[PDB]
Structure 1
Amino acid sequence: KVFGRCELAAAMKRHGLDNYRGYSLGNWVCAAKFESNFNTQATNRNTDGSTDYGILQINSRWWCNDGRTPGSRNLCNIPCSALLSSDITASVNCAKKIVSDGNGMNAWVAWRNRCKGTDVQAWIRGCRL
């Protein structure tokens, strides 16, 4: 599914991301924008052989099982395919484990390079929440 900006904000908020580990909603929306362009079906193969999946481009080296990432972990205990669903629940729960892991939202390179320190409030501007 390709979410609209406010639709995704509301779904993120319903699922408990707003101010989760102190990251305001706009941070999560901005991350999703630049990681997946709001498309739940996004995948992107890395040089290292792992793959990033879903609205928040969650990576198979650590977080999910795709069956083809040699030597990897599955810390969220899910198949990577679950991060592709139009229901963002699996991506939300995993992102919660990720953001709690020690580097916060710096684990999302696209957040770090395009969202961090910007006016991320703009990403929820005009949304009923």
Structure 2
Amino acid sequence: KVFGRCELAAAMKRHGLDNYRGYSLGNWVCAAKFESNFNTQATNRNTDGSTDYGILQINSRWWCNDGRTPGSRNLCNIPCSALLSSDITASVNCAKKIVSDGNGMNAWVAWRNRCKGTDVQAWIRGCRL
């Protein structure tokens, strides 16, 4: 599924991401835009052989099991394919564990390089939330 911007904002809010660990909703929408272009089916392979999955590009070396990342931890205890669903629940629940692990949203390279320090509230401007 490819979300609209406000559609995704509303889904993320309903799933408790607004201000989760202090990160306003715009941060999450911005990260999703640049990680996946709002596409739940996005996948990208990394140089170390791990793969990133879904709207928030969650990595198989630490967070989910895709059966082909040797020595990987499955800290969200989910198959990586569950992160590609049109229902973003599994991605949101895993993202909450990631953002609580010490480094905050810096875990998402695109957030660090393209959202951090910008006016992220623009990502939810105009939305009926």
TM-score normalised by length of structure 2: 1.00
- In structure 2, distance between residues paired with 1:105 and 1:6: 21
Deviations 1:48-97 (A, max 9, x none): 00000000000000000000001100000000000000000000000000
- In structure 1, distance between residues paired with 2:64 and 2:85: 14
Give the alignment's Cα RMSD to 1 decimal.
Answer: 0.2
Deviations 1:24-64 (A, max 9, x none): 00000000000000000000000000000000000000000
Do structure 1's residue 61 and structure 2's residue 25 form an aligned pair? Answer: no
- In structure 2, distance between residues paired with 1:46 and 1:12: 26
Other structure's SS at 1:92 match: helix
Which stretches of structure 1, 4 residues or more, deviate above 3 A after TM superposition?
none
Other structure's SS at 2:105 match: helix
- In structure 2, distance between residues paired with 1:87 and 1:2: 11
- In structure 2, distance between residues paired with 1:6 and 1:27: 13
Gaps of 5+ in 2: none
- In structure 2, distance between residues paired with 1:128 and 1:95: 24
Quote the residue 1:102 is aligned against.
102
Other structure's SS at 1:28 match: helix
- In structure 2, distance between residues paired with 1:26 and 1:82: 24
Matched residues, percent identical?
A: 100
- In structure 2, distance between residues paired with 1:56 and 1:12: 12
- In structure 2, distance between residues paired with 1:39 and 1:98: 20
Following superposition, the deviation at residue 110 of structure 1 comes to: 0.3
Gaps of 5+ in 1: none
Following superposition, the deviation at residue 125 of structure 1 comes to: 0.5
TM-score normalised by length of structure 1: 1.00
Following superposition, the deviation at residue 116 of structure 1 comes to: 0.2
Quote the residue 2:72 is aligned against.
72
Other structure's SS at 2:62 match: coil
